[PDB]
Amino acid sequence: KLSEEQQHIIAILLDAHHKTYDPTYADFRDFRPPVRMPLSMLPHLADLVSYSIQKVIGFAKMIPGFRDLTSDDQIVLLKSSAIEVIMLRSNQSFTMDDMSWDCGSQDYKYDVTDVSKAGHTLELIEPLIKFQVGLKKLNLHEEEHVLLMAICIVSPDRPGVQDAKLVEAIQDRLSNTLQTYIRCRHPPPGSHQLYAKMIQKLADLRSLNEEHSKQYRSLSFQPENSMKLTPLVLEVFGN
């Protein structure tokens, strides 16, 4: 079934995720307050994204094999995947009850209008919501969720990757763990075409990444909006 190395990888990723994702969202109180009356939600959501990039980095450093990469490739992988992993990890707070990201209180409950109040349009937000729904619908085990984030981060085809054979090798070990996990631990019918549907989510994330990058570039070009960002967001996403 699952090898000991495969069981090891899952236990580490589970722990890595628990150490970087607080399901009580207690730190949200440190963010600039949400304003729902412009781009009124930009300070709050920029802080949320900035915080989330830090946590995504803390998760990534714990992925078995990620440490063996050069710092340059570590950098390229995190820079290109950061928004995608934020999209993936946000599925935990996302609720199909009202199509929103519910982080524990009405202040920290984010809907379509809040995201648009951060400078984004339906060109991003509609496919984003549709992503979140299709992802929710997979009913992933936490083990599959954390494997999916890790696979997303160690993607050998990201532009600027130097040692791609190594990135592919690290990813393959994660991919094989996920396939084996689905076969051994995920009961049918839930498991039906589950790996192929998870991989399709990774494809959906490329389009979302591209559209986010387009809108972010337009947003951040205005010095008055880029003023509202954080230094980390500027470094990771641009300008």
Partner: peptide, 11 residues
């Protein structure tokens, strides 16, 4: 490039 913050967080 230049990513001192990302670099710092990466250890």
């Amino acid at each position: 490039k230049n990513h001192p913050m990302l670099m710092n967080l990466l250890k």
